[PDB]
């Protein structure tokens, strides 16, 4: 329901959302197991798992004191697992449309991978995004050596596919994820700063002026590693300038994002000099 998703997305109280959601996922999941073939459901539960790992698992952990790092590592591991689960849920909607999809995309054969992605339409873009995103989120929480380079590559190819079908999708959101990925990976892992900036430029074509995220993404995926405090500081000011009451939709995610910007600004000393 539309007014039901509203009481969550337009919410300003993070604790409330966090205490109410787990059961909602449990339900959507139980539903999905009744209807494995229902594609909107598969995707919906996967999307929820991912968004929940981020906001209520990974994010809170990032705010832990640097000696709580063991607790912080469990949490990262918890979140890594939720990301994967939500990513398999979403992917199983693709497997419903295109039987044999999973086996191709995870083949490790670049041709099989691209062929199978070539048969994807504008209808699959949201699905591609969530799966690609879920894996990439997981990979970022994954102990070095524990990933499978082909799995990552596949996930990234899904995002790049999405961009190709529907560049402007969800006010640019695929570029956002891609920007974080390219900037955090070596020129030898399929990443780089050149790619990263290129994806960011696109992001700024499509992104909303009421969205804090792209400023934040700019501050900490670009400005930090390039050691630009100025850019870092100005971007966060931009992010924090936005009024949550004045935004049309997604008040919660704005509030979440600003909580992060505040934190980033408090700690600028730890990222620069």
């Amino acid at each position: 329901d539309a007014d039901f998703t509203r009481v969550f997305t337009e919410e300003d109280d993070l604790d409330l959302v966090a205490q109410s959601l787990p059961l909602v996922l449990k339900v959507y999941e139980a539903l999905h197991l009744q209807n494995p073939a229902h594609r909107g459901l598969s995707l919906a539960v996967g999307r929820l798992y991912i968004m929940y790992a981020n906001a209520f698992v990974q994010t809170p952990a990032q705010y832990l004191p640097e000696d709580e790092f063991e607790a912080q590592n469990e949490a990262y591991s918890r979140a890594r697992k939720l990301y994967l689960r939500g990513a398999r849920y979403a992917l199983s909607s693709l497997e419903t449309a295109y039987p044999g999809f999973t086996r191709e995309v995870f083949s490790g054969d670049e041709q099989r991978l691209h062929k199978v992605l070539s048969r994807c339409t504008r209808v699959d873009v949201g699905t591609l995004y969530w799966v690609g995103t879920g894996y990439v989120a997981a990979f970022a929480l994954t102990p070095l050596g524990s990933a499978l380079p082909d799995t990552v590559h596949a996930a990234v190819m899904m995002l790049e596919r999405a961009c190709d079908l529907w560049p402007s999708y969800q006010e640019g959101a695929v570029w956002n994820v891609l920007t974080k990925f390219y900037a955090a990976a070596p020129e030898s892992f399929g990443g780089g700063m050149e790619k990263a900036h290129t994806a960011f430029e696109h992001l700024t074509r499509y992104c909303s002026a009421h969205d804090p995220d792209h400023h934040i993404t700019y501050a900490d995926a670009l400005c930090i590693p390039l050691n630009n405090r100025a850019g870092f500081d100005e971007a966060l000011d931009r992010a924090l300038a936005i009024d949550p009451e004045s935004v049309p939709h997604n008040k919660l995610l704005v509030i979440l994002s600003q909580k992060r910007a505040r934190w980033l600004k408090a700690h600028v000393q730890d990222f620069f000099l």
Binding site: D67, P143, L144, G145, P149, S188, D270
Partner: protein, 300 residues
């Protein structure tokens, strides 16, 4: 009150990155929260060398690139003489019983060494196999440390981490020199048919803190503090063994033949390597500490 900036050369999700925090929290609590460690990335501040001139930032974790950048008088690269230190236990004995000699050069640059540890064991990852060290030396293998191997008769190409795949696919490289975690985690194993499992030498690191900043620390705390950095060193050397066997089995499950040298062959390589040692001493004295060298052979 006291907070230390350590520029860190430790990888994103690595055990080092994790171990450096376990230490920072182990210290903090020991000082009662007064002293701690905030880590900064060396890529971000302009590389291992750019980090040097910032000693603003008081402390660092260094590979022999920067470690021998501020103590040319350093023995250091001595430890990576091939087959010199050939296994994890031997490395412990050498960082332990030999601490003061390894250390001293760095108090001559004005730093106290917190602890030593290993980035990994160099191995060869190759498209073709080899009967002898000599034949291997014929192969064009890609990788500071490299210029030394060239001396021993290793045909070496100096290439960025990127161009490895293209160069393999092009037949302009027969293989490359690296550590197991690299060749696994990058997928570069896909391009290679053979991986040497027999350890050659450690790639040593590297943690230094500035003499001044080590002053703000009250006399009381130094001991159990520095015994914490040695606890760390030991944990890693263990975990690193586990991680390397894992990386090897994954490389092997993936279809790469794992090369193992017999003790026969190992002695054959030791000898051919000791002969080169004389040669380096001539073509650069500053990259080998000869008394550190010999004191290690003594030790085993």
């Amino acid at each position: 009150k006291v907070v230390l900036k350590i520029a860190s050369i430790a990888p994103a999700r690595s055990i080092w990155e994790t171990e450096l925090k376990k230490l920072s929290a182990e210290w903090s609590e020991i000082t009662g929260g007064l002293v701690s460690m905030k880590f900064y990335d060396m890529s971000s501040l302009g590389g291992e060398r750019e980090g040097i001139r910032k000693l603003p930032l008081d402390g660092a974790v260094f590979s022999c690139l920067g470690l021998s950048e501020l103590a040319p008088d350093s023995g250091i690269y001595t430890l990576s003489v091939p087959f010199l230190i050939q296994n994890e236990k031997d490395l412990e004995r050498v960082l332990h019983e030999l601490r003061e000699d390894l250390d001293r050069p760095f108090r001559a640059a004005g730093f106290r060494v917190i602890t030593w540890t290993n980035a990994g064991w160099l191995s060869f990852y190759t498209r073709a196999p080899y009967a002898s060290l000599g034949q291997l030396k014929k192969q064009t293998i890609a990788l500071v440390l490299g210029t030394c191997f060239r001396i021993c008769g290793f045909d070496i190409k100096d290439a960025p981490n990127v161009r490895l795949a293209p160069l393999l696919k092009a037949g302009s490289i027969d293989g490359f020199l690296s550590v197991h975690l690299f060749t696994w985690a990058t997928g570069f194993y896909r391009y290679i048919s053979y991986a040497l499992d027999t350890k050659i030498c450690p790639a040593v690191i590297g943690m230094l803190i500035s003499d001044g900043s080590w002053a703000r620390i009250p006399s009381r705390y130094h001991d159990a503090m520095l015994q914490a950095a040695t606890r760390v060193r030991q944990r890693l050397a263990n975990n690193l063994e586990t991680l390397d066997r894992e990386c090897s089995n994954n490389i092997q499950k993936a279809g790469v033949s794992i090369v193992h040298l017999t003790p026969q062959e190992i002695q054959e390589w030791r000898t051919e390597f000791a002969a080169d040692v004389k040669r380096i001493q001539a073509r650069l004295p500053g990259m080998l500490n000869m008394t550190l060298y010999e004191k290690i052979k003594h030790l085993l």
